[PDB]
Amino acid sequence: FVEPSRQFVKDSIRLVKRCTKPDRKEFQKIAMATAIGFAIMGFIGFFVKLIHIPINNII
Amino acid sequence: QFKEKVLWTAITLFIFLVCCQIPLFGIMSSDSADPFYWMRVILASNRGTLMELGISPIVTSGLIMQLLAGARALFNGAQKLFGMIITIGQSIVYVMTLLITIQLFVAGLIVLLLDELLGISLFIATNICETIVWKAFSPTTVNTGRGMEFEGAIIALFHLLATRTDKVRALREAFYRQNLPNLMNLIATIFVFAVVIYFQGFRVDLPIKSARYRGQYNTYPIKLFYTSNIPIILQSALVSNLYVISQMLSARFSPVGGLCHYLSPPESFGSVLEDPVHAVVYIVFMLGSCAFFSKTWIEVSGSSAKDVAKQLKEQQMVMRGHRETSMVHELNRYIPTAAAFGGLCIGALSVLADFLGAIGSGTGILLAVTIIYQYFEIFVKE
Numbered sequence A: 001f002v003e004p005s006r007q008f009v010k011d012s013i014r015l016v017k018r019c020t021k022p023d024r025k026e027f028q029k030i031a032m033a034t035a036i037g038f039a040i041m042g043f044i045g046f047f048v049k050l051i052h053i054p055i056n057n058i059i
Numbered sequence B: 001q002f003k004e005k006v007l008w009t010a011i012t013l014f015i016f017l018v019c020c021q022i023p024l025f026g027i028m029s030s031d032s033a034d035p036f037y038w039m040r041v042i043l044a045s046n047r048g049t050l051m052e053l054g055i056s057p058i059v060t061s062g063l064i065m066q067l068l069a070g071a072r073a074l075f076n077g078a079q080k081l082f083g084m085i086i087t088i089g090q091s092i093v094y095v096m097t098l099l100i101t102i103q104l105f106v107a108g109l110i111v112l113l114l115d116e117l118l119g120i121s122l123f124i125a126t127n128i129c130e131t132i133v134w135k136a137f138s139p140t141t142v143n144t145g146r147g148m149e150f151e152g153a154i155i156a157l158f159h160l161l162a163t164r165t166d167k168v169r170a171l172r173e174a175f176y177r178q179n180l181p182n183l184m185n186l187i188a189t190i191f192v193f194a195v196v197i198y199f200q201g202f203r204v205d206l207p208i209k210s211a212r213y214r215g216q217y218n219t220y221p222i223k224l225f226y227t228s229n230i231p232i233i234l235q236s237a238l239v240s241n242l243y244v245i246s247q248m249l250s251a252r253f254s255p256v257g258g259l260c261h262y263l264s265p266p267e268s269f270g271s272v273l274e275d276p277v278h279a280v281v282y283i284v285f286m287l288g289s290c291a292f293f294s295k296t297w298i299e300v301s302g303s304s305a306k307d308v309a310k311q312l313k314e315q316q317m318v319m320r321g322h323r324e325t326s327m328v329h330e331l332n333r334y335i336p337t338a339a340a341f342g343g344l345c346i347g348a349l350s351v352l353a354d355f356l357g358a359i360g361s362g363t364g365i366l367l368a369v370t371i372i373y374q375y376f377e378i379f380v381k382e
C-alpha cells in the first residue's frame, strides 16, 4: 500500500518530463500581462486610500 | 467591445467602493468582526457589513432548489430574491452576536447582468490587489516606538532615508522586522508571482486533426493547473475560514490556542519553533487535503477524462492516433496526474508563500494570480 504512492510519484515525474515549459519569451509575455493586469487593479485601492483619508479626516 | 469591457468593470469598481462602506447601526470594537475577520479574503474586506454574503449564496440557494427539484425565467428571477433574503437573515445574527438590502441586491444584479448580457472572483482579486498596494503605501499611523508616522513600507523608507542616516542599521531593521510590512517581505511577493506565473504556463499539448479537414492542427492544452487555482484554493479557504470561526464561536457558546497545534499557518522567519510537528501536519493538510479536493473536483465538474472526449467528439474533433473512442485512454494517462499533482504542487506553492511569507496568508495571494490569468484569457479572446 506504498506501491500505489510509488506509482503516483513515478507517473508525476513522467508527466513533468512530458509537459512543455515557458522558457524565456512567453514567460516574459505572460509576466508582462499579469504585471499590467496587476497594475490596473492595484492602484484602485491606492485611489481608495486617496479618496478616503479626506473622508476619514472629516468623519 | 473596447468601451464595454472597461465600462462594466467601472460599474463593478464603483459598486465595490460604495460597498466598501461601514454601517451606522452602532459602533463597537472588533467583537462582531472576529468571525468576519477570517472571511476577509472570502468576499470583501471590512470589519462590518460591506459585501457579506452577496453573490455566492444566490448560487448555493440555486443549488438547494435544484436539489429539491431533482431529488427558467421564474427560476432566474427568484434566484436574486432568495439569495438576497438570506444575507439579511444572516446579518440579523451578525448584528446580534437594515441597510444591506438594496446594496447587496444591486451588487448581485450588476454582476448577474454582466454574466448574462455581457465576476465573482474579480471581487477577491481587487481585495488582494488593494492589499499589496496598501502594504506598500502605508504612511498612515500614529507615531509608534520608531518612525515619524510610518509603517516601514516603501514610501515610508523613501521619506525616511533623507531624514535618517546610519544605513548600516537601517538595512538590518528593514530586513528583520516582524510586525509591519517589511522590505525583504515585498521581494517575496514578487518571487511567488514570478514562480507561479512560470508554473502557470506548464501544460501538456495534444494533437487534433478535425474530421474531414486535411491538417488543421487545432491542438488542445491540458494545463498543469488543469483546475485553475480557483476550485482548489477556494476549497482550502472554505474549509479553513469556516472551521476557524466555528472553533471561535463554539468555544465561547459552550479553542483558539488550546487546539492550534494542527490549525495555524506559520508566518515566522524562524520556522523551527516549539512545535515543528505542527509544520509537518500543516504541510500534510495543505498538500493532501487540497489535492484530494482537486481529484474529487474533476469527477464532478464536467471536465473529467470521460467527459472531455464527449466535448471533443461533439465539436467534430478527433485525435490523430488510434480509434474513435480510444481518445479517452489516450489522455487518461495525463488527466488524473494533472489533477492530483496539479493539486499538490499548488499546495506546495501556497506553503512556500507562507514559509517564506510573501504578502499574506498564502491563500488569497496565490489565488489572485488565477483571476489575473482568467481575465487575461478573456482580454486576449475578445
Ligand SMILES: C/C1=C/C[C@H]([C@@H](C)C/C(C)=C\[C@@H](C)[C@H](O)C[C@@H](C)O)OC(=O)CCC[C@H](OC(=O)/C=C/C(C)=C/C(C)=C/C=C/C(C)=C/[C@H](O)[C@@H](O)C[C@H](C)O)[C@@H](C)C1
Pocket (backbone or CB within 6 Å): B059, B060, B063, B115, B120, B231, B296, B300, B301
Ligand atoms: C458552492 C459550490 C460551487 C461549485 C461551482 C462554482 C465554483 C461555479 C460558479 C462560480 C458558478 C456556476 C454555478 C455557473 O456555471 C456560472 C455561469 C457563468 O455558468 O458550481 C457548482 O455548484 C457545480 C458543482 C456542485 C458543487 O458540489 C461539490 O463541490 C461537492 C464536493 C464534495 C466534498 C463531494 C463529496 C465527496 C461528498 C461526500 C459523499 C459521500 C461520503 C458518499 C457516500 O460514500 C455514499 O456513496 C454512500 C452512503 C453510505 O449511502 C457545489 C455544491 C459547490
